[PDB]
Amino acid sequence: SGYSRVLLKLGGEMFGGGQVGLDPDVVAQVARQIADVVRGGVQIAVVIGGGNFFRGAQLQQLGMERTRSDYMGMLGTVMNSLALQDFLEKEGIVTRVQTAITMGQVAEPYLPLRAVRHLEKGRVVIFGAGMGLPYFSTDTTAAQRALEIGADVVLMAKAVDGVFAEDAELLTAVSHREVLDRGLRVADATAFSLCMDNGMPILVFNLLTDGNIARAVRGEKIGTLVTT
Amino acid sequence: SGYSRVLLKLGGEMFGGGQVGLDPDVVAQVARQIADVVRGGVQIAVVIGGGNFFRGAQLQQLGMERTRSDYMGMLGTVMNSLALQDFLEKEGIVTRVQTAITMGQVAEPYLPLRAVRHLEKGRVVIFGAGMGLPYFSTDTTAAQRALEIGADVVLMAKAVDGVFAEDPRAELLTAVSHREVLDRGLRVADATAFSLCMDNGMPILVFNLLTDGNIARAVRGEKIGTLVTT
Amino acid sequence: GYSRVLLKLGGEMFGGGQVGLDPDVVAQVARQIADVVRGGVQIAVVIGGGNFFRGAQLQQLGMERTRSDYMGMLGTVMNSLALQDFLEKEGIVTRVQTAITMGQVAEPYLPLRAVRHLEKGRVVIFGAGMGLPYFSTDTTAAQRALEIGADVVLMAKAVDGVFLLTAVSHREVLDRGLRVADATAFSLCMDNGMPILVFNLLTDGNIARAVRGEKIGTLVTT
Amino acid sequence: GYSRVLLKLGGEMFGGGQVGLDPDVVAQVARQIADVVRGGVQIAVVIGGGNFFRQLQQLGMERTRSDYMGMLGTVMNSLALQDFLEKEGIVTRVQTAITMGQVAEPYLPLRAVRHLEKGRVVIFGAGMGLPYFSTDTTAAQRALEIGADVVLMAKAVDLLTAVSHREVLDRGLRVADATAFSLCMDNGMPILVFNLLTDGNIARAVRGEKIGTLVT
Amino acid sequence: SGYSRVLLKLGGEMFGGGQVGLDPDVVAQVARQIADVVRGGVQIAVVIGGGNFFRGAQLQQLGMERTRSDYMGMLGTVMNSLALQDFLEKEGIVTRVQTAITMGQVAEPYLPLRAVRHLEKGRVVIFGAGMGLPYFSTDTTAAQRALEIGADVVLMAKAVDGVFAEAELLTAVSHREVLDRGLRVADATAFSLCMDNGMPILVFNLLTDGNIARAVRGEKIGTLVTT
Amino acid sequence: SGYSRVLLKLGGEMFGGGQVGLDPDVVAQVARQIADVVRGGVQIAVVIGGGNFFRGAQLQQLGMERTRSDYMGMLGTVMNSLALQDFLEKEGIVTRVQTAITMGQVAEPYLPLRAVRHLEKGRVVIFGAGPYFSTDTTAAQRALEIGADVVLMAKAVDGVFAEDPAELLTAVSHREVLDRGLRVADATAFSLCMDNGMPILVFNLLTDGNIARAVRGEKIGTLVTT
Numbered sequence A: 001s002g003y004s005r006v007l008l009k010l011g012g013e014m015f016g017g018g019q020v021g022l023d024p025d026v027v028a029q030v031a032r033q034i035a036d037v038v039r040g041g042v043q044i045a046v047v048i049g050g051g052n053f054f055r056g057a058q059l060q061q062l063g064m065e066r067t068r069s070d071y072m073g074m075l076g077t078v079m080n081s082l083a084l085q086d087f088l089e090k091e092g093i094v095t096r097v098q099t100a101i102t103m104g105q106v107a108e109p110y111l112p113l114r115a116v117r118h119l120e121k122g123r124v125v126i127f128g129a130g131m132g133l134p135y136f137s138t139d140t141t142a143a144q145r146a147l148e149i150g151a152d153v154v155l156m157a158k159a160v161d162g163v164f165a166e167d168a169e170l171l172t173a174v175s176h177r178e179v180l181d182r183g184l185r186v187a188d189a190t191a192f193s194l195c196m197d198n199g200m201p202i203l204v205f206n207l208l209t210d211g212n213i214a215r216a217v218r219g220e221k222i223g224t225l226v227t228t
Numbered sequence B: 001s002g003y004s005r006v007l008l009k010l011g012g013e014m015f016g017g018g019q020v021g022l023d024p025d026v027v028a029q030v031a032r033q034i035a036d037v038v039r040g041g042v043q044i045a046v047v048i049g050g051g052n053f054f055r056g057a058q059l060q061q062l063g064m065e066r067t068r069s070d071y072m073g074m075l076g077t078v079m080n081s082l083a084l085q086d087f088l089e090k091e092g093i094v095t096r097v098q099t100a101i102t103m104g105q106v107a108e109p110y111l112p113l114r115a116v117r118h119l120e121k122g123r124v125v126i127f128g129a130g131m132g133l134p135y136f137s138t139d140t141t142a143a144q145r146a147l148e149i150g151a152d153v154v155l156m157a158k159a160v161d162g163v164f165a166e167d168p169r170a171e172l173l174t175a176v177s178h179r180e181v182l183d184r185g186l187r188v189a190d191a192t193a194f195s196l197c198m199d200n201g202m203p204i205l206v207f208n209l210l211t212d213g214n215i216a217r218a219v220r221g222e223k224i225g226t227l228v229t230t
Numbered sequence C: 001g002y003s004r005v006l007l008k009l010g011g012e013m014f015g016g017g018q019v020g021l022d023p024d025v026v027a028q029v030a031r032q033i034a035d036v037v038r039g040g041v042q043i044a045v046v047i048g049g050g051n052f053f054r055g056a057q058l059q060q061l062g063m064e065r066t067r068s069d070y071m072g073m074l075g076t077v078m079n080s081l082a083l084q085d086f087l088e089k090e091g092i093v094t095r096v097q098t099a100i101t102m103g104q105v106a107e108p109y110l111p112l113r114a115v116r117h118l119e120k121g122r123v124v125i126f127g128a129g130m131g132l133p134y135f136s137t138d139t140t141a142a143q144r145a146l147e148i149g150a151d152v153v154l155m156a157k158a159v160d161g162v163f164l165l166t167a168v169s170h171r172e173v174l175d176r177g178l179r180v181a182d183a184t185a186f187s188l189c190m191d192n193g194m195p196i197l198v199f200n201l202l203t204d205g206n207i208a209r210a211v212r213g214e215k216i217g218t219l220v221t222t
Numbered sequence D: 001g002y003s004r005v006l007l008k009l010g011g012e013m014f015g016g017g018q019v020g021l022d023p024d025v026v027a028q029v030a031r032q033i034a035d036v037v038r039g040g041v042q043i044a045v046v047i048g049g050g051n052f053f054r055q056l057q058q059l060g061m062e063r064t065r066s067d068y069m070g071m072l073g074t075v076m077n078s079l080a081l082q083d084f085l086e087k088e089g090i091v092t093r094v095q096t097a098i099t100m101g102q103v104a105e106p107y108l109p110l111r112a113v114r115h116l117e118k119g120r121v122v123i124f125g126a127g128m129g130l131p132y133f134s135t136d137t138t139a140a141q142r143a144l145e146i147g148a149d150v151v152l153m154a155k156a157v158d159l160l161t162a163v164s165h166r167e168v169l170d171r172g173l174r175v176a177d178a179t180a181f182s183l184c185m186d187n188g189m190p191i192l193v194f195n196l197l198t199d200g201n202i203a204r205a206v207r208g209e210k211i212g213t214l215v216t
Numbered sequence E: 001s002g003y004s005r006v007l008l009k010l011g012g013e014m015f016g017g018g019q020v021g022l023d024p025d026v027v028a029q030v031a032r033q034i035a036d037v038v039r040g041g042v043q044i045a046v047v048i049g050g051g052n053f054f055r056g057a058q059l060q061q062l063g064m065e066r067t068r069s070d071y072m073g074m075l076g077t078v079m080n081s082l083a084l085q086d087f088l089e090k091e092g093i094v095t096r097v098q099t100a101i102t103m104g105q106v107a108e109p110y111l112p113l114r115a116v117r118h119l120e121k122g123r124v125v126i127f128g129a130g131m132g133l134p135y136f137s138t139d140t141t142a143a144q145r146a147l148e149i150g151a152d153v154v155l156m157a158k159a160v161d162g163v164f165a166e167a168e169l170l171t172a173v174s175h176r177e178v179l180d181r182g183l184r185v186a187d188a189t190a191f192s193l194c195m196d197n198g199m200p201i202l203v204f205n206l207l208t209d210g211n212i213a214r215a216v217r218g219e220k221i222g223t224l225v226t227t
Numbered sequence F: 001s002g003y004s005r006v007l008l009k010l011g012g013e014m015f016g017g018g019q020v021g022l023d024p025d026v027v028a029q030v031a032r033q034i035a036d037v038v039r040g041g042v043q044i045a046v047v048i049g050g051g052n053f054f055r056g057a058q059l060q061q062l063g064m065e066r067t068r069s070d071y072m073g074m075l076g077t078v079m080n081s082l083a084l085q086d087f088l089e090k091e092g093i094v095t096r097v098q099t100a101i102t103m104g105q106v107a108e109p110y111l112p113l114r115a116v117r118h119l120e121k122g123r124v125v126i127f128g129a130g131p132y133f134s135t136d137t138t139a140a141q142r143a144l145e146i147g148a149d150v151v152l153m154a155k156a157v158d159g160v161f162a163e164d165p166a167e168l169l170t171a172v173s174h175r176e177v178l179d180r181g182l183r184v185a186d187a188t189a190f191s192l193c194m195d196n197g198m199p200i201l202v203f204n205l206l207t208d209g210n211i212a213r214a215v216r217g218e219k220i221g222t223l224v225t226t
């Protein structure tokens, strides 16, 4: 039972708390939760999203170029990354932040072999700037990094308990292909492909209800498990 | 009578519109008013603030560490820089962005000799990431950059007409000495920004940027706003 | 006709159906890229690397895929430096950016600079794919095309088009099941409406005729 | 016997006779490294890349750019070795003379020694980091910088059982590239030419047994 | 009492020994003194001044451009930084030099997260090139580098015992009181940066053998500025 | 003669001129002599040493690691280079500082194809830096790479004497210096020129108006040519 190495995707919702900017009362709750599961010995890499600031396709619909707006939005997710790092630090947790856009003064660059040893060294690894590339999502970054750093599962942390059938019975266990056949919102379509095609399982759970991610990695039947 | 090269300081309210985030109505209007001055033949670099995302000092008081919160603030500065770049592109203006924190993929690093040479080429240089270091401000950034690139004056763009003896609810000042600002307690900039310009004789001009046509006035030498000098 | 183009070169176009480098192939490629820079087209090109290793074929031989994807990606810099040399001997100015930073071998990926190079009449070569495992070169050419703001993706093959449909909608190739490029890359093209033109490069003057706007190959367009 | 060894592997040791990569050859090359590691000797490996060429110097490429492609090819050989070692249960550390970060650790010699002392096998890819250098010279140089006891020139061929640096130069015997050989003869490194591919012959070699040809 | 992580300002006086250029006797003495406090267990980062070569404002007075002169003067600090690295290495002390103006192969760029990690590994971080920007001092660079790397105090290493009142050496002043008495501690702008963030400043005679380990243990030597 | 593009080599100890450090009174006149040349119409590239920021055999004896000791010298050349850039600009001369080690913020990297592009545009280019080589050698190599017609070794003696402690010789051949044992430049520097035909002109720099006579093709100093 259990997952030894996980990749946790935090949306911008987990930083802004719904609205724009930063909600310290959420990042605190967010950090107390990660810390509870690191003390259990799980190696946990965190991929940071950035919708509490900008989203590239949102700003392009307004008139801004998309490329320039995708960089704008990856830069927001570094700001979340520095903020998760501070709150995890007040929790006693050692952090290592890695950005896909290299910014030496601010974080070490993307080096996957070192990111894997940080974990083994018991450090929490924070991937910022997503994948570094415009026309991609942080959902897809979580799929990508999770496959490269040898994660056992991608933990899609949400503010509701799992995947329902419309917005309504919540279903606990589904095939990857079962999700697409029932037209379900599990992640990016692009992200889901990279996972399904490579057999990477995904767990959609309510990270904010107390002590749920620790339940998750112990193997308990928590949330929704997408597995092939 | 006339400034040849200028350094304009845009606070975060020129991107957030008073509020946290990005109000595209304001950058569009600021981008419109910069293009008007570029076609007039002024060389203009732009130091960009980030009040509309994070200030390190206020997050420090919420409990966050100052240095991490200051980096968050400088990262927000490049987000405003890229946004000014976009709107300034839609006005048909050629821009080079430079980040004090080095980010090859996003913008060329801070190289000051190339900066003044883009200006000579007719381009607008946008100075992102502040000074690249915590425990500083973009007001002080403007003071330093203006000095390093040989700007004739620091343009402190505000949304009011200038400095007034006493807040609001009426008496505006046209021309002040540097020591006049100090002896009277007027707020023109950071204590450090101002000291950096006063000690090196850089003039500061505080003016209402948002009234259509006014920056282009200020640069042609018009007696607009508030000029602190000598 | 097209102002900025992103041409995708597979390991076919360096190794030639065998393994390694067949310099008669590479030289003809350079010969044809040469033709279009004289034409006034801004061309950036993405280099694939199946004449050495493919990450998913080595993964089936036994090897770990991550480690093998990097092997594949270095393969493309070898192909990338090869094109550089021959295009130079055709008299063309090149500049090679790698998605995996190597400093001394080539400049890193600076996309705003890749585009000032095009504007200056130079040919930008995009090596090391996207610099990430679990991706293909076809996906790279879509991403790189949208980022440098190219008008169309030239999918260079050695057959002339796909089968010979001369113009097809983005949704019509999903509905008939024709093959144009990787499914991950095509969907990133369809979803952003980036056109893809599949054409025989190896016939003389074909690509020069493609950027000219001529009915050539198979054009996928919504 | 020998305590620390530098092993030079030609392109031949990766593609076999022909071009590209041969899993059989690489697998038996690693099987041989493994029972050596297990034997207690610290072993660092310099990797060549002749399996990615033929015609190279008949196309006219430059040598600067040419030499860099070869150097890139050695890093593909290193990653490949590292994989087949890993399946044999051997911990490795690939270093490159050309900084790459994302692919591999840079070349620091102090930190390579650290790795050997910690029981890991160091693979040196990208050669010397510069054009106009061979691999025989990278081997001669890195054997020196990490303090190896001997350079092991792994050939595919099996008779002189001992010559010396001052003895060979009188005969038409090429044991390695003349720039590499002139570095070893000048600094007192021995050179052992042997058949790596006869089963368990490198284990006998570092034990001190009469194998192949030793140059002192 | 004692300081657990410290930042040490060495002016040009501490390499040129007074005259211009470099004086190995002075530098050796300075490395001896740093080395024996690193074994004490102190994490120590050093900011290197440059008056034994160039000072921006002084070349400015001779006609030269300030901006260019400031850069001249910054490269002077790297020259000193390499000397201090050298003498400390010959004392068997692991050093790491980070330079504000990045040169790559001469030293590593400014990476502050990694500077505190060097200190935690027991290494001596040397801060060359000041802050990298014209129109600043290395006194301000120490005040800045000390706040960001988290140091407990700034050690203004002088050749005199401490801050005087023109005899009369002062053992402990408050920040506000230095400005009110017009005492000369550091820079004007360097002191403000310190005063405004509550960063203490100990001014002491580094040259008298054993004074810095003395200072670090928390003994009352020199002049301590605190609020 | 009539030299159209020249590589001027100055020993660093010239700028410190009398002591250690920098004597602005000397680099000032060096700048204004170089201006007369370019406003005359000659293209001029400059290499400067570092010997003024050290006391003679300072770090030869100090025990310093030679790689680190060399980097200290390269930094001093750049300090010397910026100081020249400044007075040459007050002389009204566009200048460009190129550094062998990339120092983006301080100057521009070394690209020789761009370096002649500067001289063609009436600008002076200044070469800093160059481990384990002397600035004599770098002057030899820059001069070759930028197509210079001649390497002007500006030294503090009138030329090359036959005996040394005589008569200063005015014209020698490349094979003649190696054979007679004459002090022209570093051995590696000299072999770089003699193996590539590159002529070398040794002349005293402290006497004013001499740089101008070198380029003009006055028969001054010692001309070494094969």
Ligand SMILES: O=c1ccn([C@@H]2O[C@H](COP(=O)(O)OP(=O)(O)OP(=O)(O)O)[C@@H](O)[C@H]2O)c(=O)[nH]1
Residues within 6 Å of the ligand: B095, B096, B097, B098, B103, B104, B105, B106, B107, B108, B109, C110, C111, C112, C113, C116, C117
């Ligand atoms: O490291 C870098 C350097 C530059 N850039 C960005 O690339 C763009 C082109 O920068 P370039 O250096 O390629 O040319 P230039 O237009 O700036 O100047 P000149 O050719 O006239 O000499 C500029 O917008 C720059 O900000 C990066 O994104 N990263």
Ligand SMILES: O=c1ccn([C@@H]2O[C@H](COP(=O)(O)OP(=O)(O)OP(=O)(O)O)[C@@H](O)[C@H]2O)c(=O)[nH]1
Residues within 6 Å of the ligand: B111, B112, B113, B114, B115, B117, F095, F096, F097, F103, F104, F105, F106, F107, F108, F109
């Ligand atoms: O990386 C660099 C490159 C260049 N520079 C410095 O910036 C200044 C101008 O930078 P540029 O390279 O863009 O123009 P240029 O004067 O050299 O020549 P043209 O393109 O107009 O033909 C030059 O003085 C150069 O030394 C840097 O400081 N850092």
Ligand SMILES: O=c1ccn([C@@H]2O[C@H](COP(=O)(O)OP(=O)(O)OP(=O)(O)O)[C@@H](O)[C@H]2O)c(=O)[nH]1
Residues within 6 Å of the ligand: A111, A112, A113, A114, A117, D092, D093, D094, D095, D100, D101, D102, D103, D104, D105, D106
């Ligand atoms: O820049 C780098 C440095 C290191 N690495 C790679 O990261 C992996 C481990 O990275 P580390 O350097 O952090 O740990 P280590 O196991 O190799 O050494 P110690 O903990 O004992 O001190 C190694 O396989 C290395 O090659 C990179 O990929 N890039």
Ligand SMILES: O=c1ccn([C@@H]2O[C@H](COP(=O)(O)OP(=O)(O)OP(=O)(O)O)[C@@H](O)[C@H]2O)c(=O)[nH]1
Residues within 6 Å of the ligand: A095, A096, A097, A103, A104, A105, A106, A107, A108, A109, E111, E112, E113, E114, E115, E117
């Ligand atoms: O380029 C860089 C490299 C590193 N760092 C940051 O410096 C800090 C020090 O990270 P280090 O690489 O210096 O050592 P470490 O913490 O990983 O400890 P060991 O593996 O050796 O056991 C890290 O937190 C990193 O994010 C940067 O800011 N920029």
Ligand SMILES: O=c1ccn([C@@H]2O[C@H](COP(=O)(O)OP(=O)(O)O)[C@@H](O)[C@H]2O)c(=O)[nH]1
Residues within 6 Å of the ligand: A010, A011, A012, A013, A049, A050, A051, A052, A054, A055, A056, A057, A069, A070, A071, A072, A073, A074, A075, A077, A129, A130, A131, A132, A133, A134, A135, A136, A137, A138, A139, A141
């Ligand atoms: O590889 C990446 C990662 C992020 N982004 C941009 O940065 C934004 C960050 O938001 P994100 O979409 O990642 O996710 P969310 O915050 O909703 O989880 C994206 O939306 C894109 O606009 C991008 O362009 N490429």
Ligand SMILES: O=c1ccn([C@@H]2O[C@H](COP(=O)(O)OP(=O)(O)O)[C@@H](O)[C@H]2O)c(=O)[nH]1
Residues within 6 Å of the ligand: B010, B011, B012, B013, B049, B050, B051, B052, B054, B055, B056, B057, B069, B070, B071, B073, B074, B129, B130, B131, B132, B133, B134, B135, B136, B137, B138, B139, B141
């Ligand atoms: O050199 C600099 C420039 C800016 N900042 C950061 O910039 C943030 C906000 O900028 P600023 O206060 O200037 O914004 P404005 O109010 O002018 O919009 C602060 O919290 C600082 O951390 C910094 O730390 N160093």
Ligand SMILES: O=c1ccn([C@@H]2O[C@H](COP(=O)(O)OP(=O)(O)O)[C@@H](O)[C@H]2O)c(=O)[nH]1
Residues within 6 Å of the ligand: C009, C010, C011, C012, C048, C049, C050, C051, C053, C054, C055, C056, C068, C069, C070, C071, C072, C073, C128, C129, C130, C131, C132, C133, C134, C135, C136, C137, C138, C140
């Ligand atoms: O972003 C990239 C680009 C390439 N590759 C690897 O490099 C190989 C290059 O193969 P590709 O399909 O691109 O080459 P082609 O057949 O088009 O020549 C891929 O298969 C992967 O193994 C990768 O992992 N990521």
Ligand SMILES: O=c1ccn([C@@H]2O[C@H](COP(=O)(O)OP(=O)(O)O)[C@@H](O)[C@H]2O)c(=O)[nH]1
Residues within 6 Å of the ligand: E010, E011, E012, E013, E048, E049, E050, E051, E052, E054, E055, E056, E057, E069, E070, E071, E072, E073, E074, E129, E130, E131, E132, E133, E134, E135, E136, E137, E138, E139, E141
């Ligand atoms: O951030 C910095 C650091 C140094 N300097 C320049 O380098 C000189 C070094 O002076 P410093 O006071 O630091 O040396 P000290 O006097 O302390 O010996 C300064 O005067 C400036 O000319 C600078 O401009 N910015």
